Amino acid sequence: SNIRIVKRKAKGFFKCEDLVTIKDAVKAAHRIMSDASILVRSYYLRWFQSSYPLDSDDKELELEHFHISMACSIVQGITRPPVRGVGPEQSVKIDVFNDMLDEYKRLYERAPNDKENETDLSLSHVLAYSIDNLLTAYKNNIEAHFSKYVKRFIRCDMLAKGFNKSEANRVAAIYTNAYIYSSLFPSKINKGGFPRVYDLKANPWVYLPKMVMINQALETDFSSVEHKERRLLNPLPFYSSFVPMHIRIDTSGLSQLLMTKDRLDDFKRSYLAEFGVSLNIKNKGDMLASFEKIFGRKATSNREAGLYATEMWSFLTNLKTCRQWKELDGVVRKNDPKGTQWMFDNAVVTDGVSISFQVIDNSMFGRKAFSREELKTSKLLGCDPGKRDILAITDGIKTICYTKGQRDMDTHKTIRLRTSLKRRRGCGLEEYETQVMNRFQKRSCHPEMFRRYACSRKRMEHMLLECYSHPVFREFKFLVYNKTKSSEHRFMHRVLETFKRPQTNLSKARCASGVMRMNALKEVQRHGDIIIGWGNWIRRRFESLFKTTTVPEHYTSQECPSCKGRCLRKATGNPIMRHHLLRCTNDSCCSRWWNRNVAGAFNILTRLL
RNA sequence: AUCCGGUAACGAAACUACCGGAGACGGGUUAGGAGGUGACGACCUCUAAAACCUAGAACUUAGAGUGCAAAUACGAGUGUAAAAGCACUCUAAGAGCAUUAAA
Ligand SMILES: [Zn+2]
């Protein structure tokens, strides 16, 4: 199906009287989720010491959906398991609640208190979607960063054994290629002979214990290794940021928040008068009943049911009487070949400052089902995606780069940091956050080190949340998104004007050949008439205005256009070995001075030609 | 304090130096422009804002328009009688979120 999102400010969307409830709901959601994540993280660490190496008669611990749900109940002070019924399958899961409950007592050094976290509002339903995001986070972190752990462990070992820090990466790469394509890998799972990549995607939980072991050794085993090389990772993600996070609100969730039995009667009377049908609702919880019993008759089609959801939002929100409704009232973009029509999807995501609207295709609205010759005339350009500079563009006679500093100035980097320090320093919390908490780095995986950090934060949790609850922090969170487009769009506009006119010089770039001059003199007047090369190593928005192509990156930083062989290496022969100075290693070269951007970008463009 | 461009010492740097332009989130609070002598200044008026305070808005780029701010001479050496910037309407091209995280 087709799904799209629209992001706008939340001002005016909610009614004035109901605005207070929404604001307070966000605070409770962040506190419960943040505390729950720490409790879950601590529990898993204890399981690591329970059995390692793993036994052959038991399966690895995999976190299920109800694990996080029980954790939230413990935080709120629930005294008994939420499990319903008795059966062989629930024999083990029932006892797990007691173990987790005991762990919560062990984490803190004081008697648990219930009302320090409970809230009178019934915000249980909202927490349902927040759990899903955390669960999916573990899979993404394990699969993506697994290869990084392997290289670092081998890299640290080489450094410890006295081997030079230059060949350590090469040695690690050789081992990594063989195993991927001694104790850092398990036995091959798939019997079909496929590479280990398929095995990694088969299940991420199997490899999670291995990463935990790697981190523990890195903290203490490699004492002599330099601090810079020992960059600790976070195999177990957890919500550490104190800033409130976003939440998802649906029709069922919205009713549980704002609807009340006394106020419910007003909705029933309004619906009956305006539609002539009386709802079969007698209590607040009856609003979640199936469509069959709501009216006593069944809908003729799936799209009919969707219309019911839309009207519910109108009563509790100014959906059709707000400024933002202009872009959601069946607006069709000018450049859609299919002429698709979109409408509100009865879903809202907000954090109290910014609101994101979910809009789906009209054709699929309701109950969804289960789920070449242009190169001759076009002007050619190449790119060399580096690290210091996000992107670089060359044409054989001049170069332009999108430096990291350019984005920093556009995003108001200095102001954001300046404002944050001053506001926090007013309450005196700066010393505790930096001087104290820095001694107990959160990325540590040992139970003892983590326990010290966990209890320390709990003591100052009340003060920290109030200080970080100021909207100023969230305002900057929206500012970066708004300014991100401006920084990227302006650079793309500069690209057109940079090469719109024929180059005014023909001899400054001595390395330029006859072919380079022929392409430079070409005149362009449209965005789509320019073709920009790209490499395997931001491209989402660039392709929307300019056509792109892929070029191999093999040996693109050593080859030279007018030499018998590779001649590019780091500059030598001077007392100072500067950061990015490059000098040719032979006199038979068109140019003796080179830099990272021009040296690599020029070769990429040459291959395209 | 930083970004961009040029200049040499064979498309050279976080210092090898110099020169010409941008910019410091929103609101209240300071110095610059224009005008009762569009001569300077004597006296006032419209806009605007670095340091400080503060629970506080906004979909993005190229261009086209409208709409703003009012109070030297004649004569019998002599008396006196449009800029910075901002707001709105348009055209063209775009328009999917929440987070974990790093060489
Ligand atoms: Zn060469």
Author numbering: 2 to 182, 204 to 393, 415 to 580, 599 to 670
What's written in the study?
pmcFanzor (Fz) is a eukaryotic programmable ωRNA-guided endonuclease 1,2. Fzs and the prokaryotic CRISPR-Cas12 systems evolved from distinct variants of TnpB, a widespread prokaryotic Obligate Mobile Element-guided Activity (OMEGA) system 1–7. To explore this diversity at the structural and functional level, we resolved the cryo-EM structures of three Fz1 proteins from different species spanning two kingdoms of eukaryotes: Guillardia theta (GtFz1) (algae), Spizellomyces punctatus (SpuFz1) (fungus), and Parasitella parasitica (PpFz1) (mycoparasite). The overall structures of the three Fz1 proteins show notable similarities, all featuring a bilobed architecture and accommodating the ωRNA and target DNA in comparable ways, consistent with TnpB structures 8,9.
We determined the structures of the GtFz1-ωRNA binary complex at resolution of 4.7 Å, a GtFz1-ωRNA-target DNA ternary complex with a target DNA containing TAM duplex and a single-strand TS at resolution of 3.3 Å, a GtFz1-ωRNA-target DNA ternary complex with full double-strand target DNA at resolution of 3.0 Å, respectively. To elucidate the conformational changes before and after R-loop formation in Fz1, we compared the binary (State I) and ternary (State II and State III) complexes of GtFz1. Although the overarching structures of GtFz1 and its ωRNA are similar in these complexes, there are clear conformational changes in the REC domain and the RNA guide region. Comparison of State I and State II, wherein the TAM has been recognized and the TS is forming base-pairs with the guide, shows that the α3 of the REC domain undergoes a shift of approximately 2 Å to accommodate TAM duplex binding. The guide region of the ωRNA, which is stabilized by both the WED and REC domains before and after DNA binding, shifts toward the REC domain by roughly 2 Å upon base pairing with the TS.
